[PDB]
DNA sequence: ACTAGAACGTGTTCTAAT
DNA sequence: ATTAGAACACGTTCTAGT
C-alpha cells in the first residue's frame, strides 16, 4: 500500500517517466532526468523503483490498467487489435520505451513483467466474450504473442504498420478457422 | 567482404562472443572482454560490430546459418520435432540463449537488417519443417515463431518452466493446424 | 525517509601513434 | 585500419546531512 506522501512521490515519478519516454523514447528515459523532472533524488527514485526496467514496466502496467478501466468474435478482436494498433502509432517513442523495457527485463523484474502479461492476455480474452472460456484465453495468449512480435518488428522499422495489421489479422484468421 | 585477416578477425570476435556468452550470459559478454579474448582492440571490435547488440545478434545469425546447413509423418509431428529440438537446445546452453535472445529483442533499428536476417531464417526453418511450404504453412510458421519467442522470454525470465513452455507451444500447434 | 552529491561499472567514443 | 589506453555517458550504489 503506502502513505499518501509515498503515493504522491510514486505518481510524480511515473508521470515524469512517461513524459520523457514520450518525448524521447527508451534511451531518453535516464534516471537522473526522471528524478529531476519528478523533483525527487536519485536514491529516492531507486527506493521506489529498483531499476530502469522496473520503472518503465511499472509505467506500462499503470497505463494498461488505466486503459482497462475505460458483434462477431473477429469484429470485437478487430476492435481491440485496432485500438491497440492506433494506440501503438499514437506515441511511437513511449511505446518504444515501455515495450523495450518489457522485453529486456531479467528475472528480477519477472513478477512485474508477469502481471502486465497476465493482464494483457486478460483484456484479449475480455475482448472475445462479454466471462471467457479456456480456449478463448489460449487463443488470446497466442494473439498477444503475435502482437508482441509484430510490435517489435514495427518499433525496429522492419515492418510497416500496415504489415503489422496484416500479419495479426492473419493470426486471428488462422486461429478462428 | 574484406581481406583474409579481416575475415579471421571477424570469426575470432564472434567465437569469443559465443564462448563468453556461454560461460556467463548477457551481462558477461562485455566489450573489453570480447576484444581481449579476440586479440583485438575495442576500437577494432566496434569497427567490426557497431554495438553489443549487433555483435550478439550477428553471432546468432552465424549459429542459425550453421544450423541451416544441416522429420516425421504428420506436419504436426515435424513441427513438434523442430519445436522439441529448439527446446532441448534452449536448455542445453541457457546462458548463450539468454545472451543472444535478450540481444535479439532489445535490438535497435540500427541492427534491423540483422534482426530481420535471423527472423526470416527461423521462420524459413519452421515452414520448411512442415513442408516447398505453402503460404499458409509460412503464416503458421511465423505465428509459431512468435509464440516460441514469447515463451522463450518467459522461460529466461524464470516466470515459466520448461514444461509450461512445451505445453503452450504444443497447444498453439494444435490451435493452428486443426 | 528524502536530498545532495560522490563514486563505481560498463557500453561507447576519442587520442596518440603507428 | 589497428592498438593501447584515456575519456565520456548513463545505470547504479554508497556516504553524509537534514
Swiss-Prot record, chain B:
Q: Where are the transmembrane segments?
A: none
Q: Which stretches hold the DNA-binding feature?
A: 30-49
UniProt keyword terms in alphabetical order: DNA-binding, Repressor, Transcription, Transcription regulation
Q: What is an example of a GO molecular function annotated in this UniProt entry?
A: DNA binding
List each copy of the HTH tetR-type domain by range: 7-67
Q: Name one GO biological process term.
A: regulation of DNA-templated transcription
- Give yes or no: UniProt keyword Transcription regulation: yes
In terms of superkingdom, the source organism counts as: Bacteria
Oligomeric form and interacting partners: Homodimer.
Main function: Controls the expression of genes used for utilizing diverse lipids as energy sources.
UniProt name for this protein: HTH-type transcriptional repressor KstR
- Organism from which the protein derives: Mycobacterium tuberculosis (strain ATCC 25618 / H37Rv)
Full-protein interval shown:
30 to 215 of 220
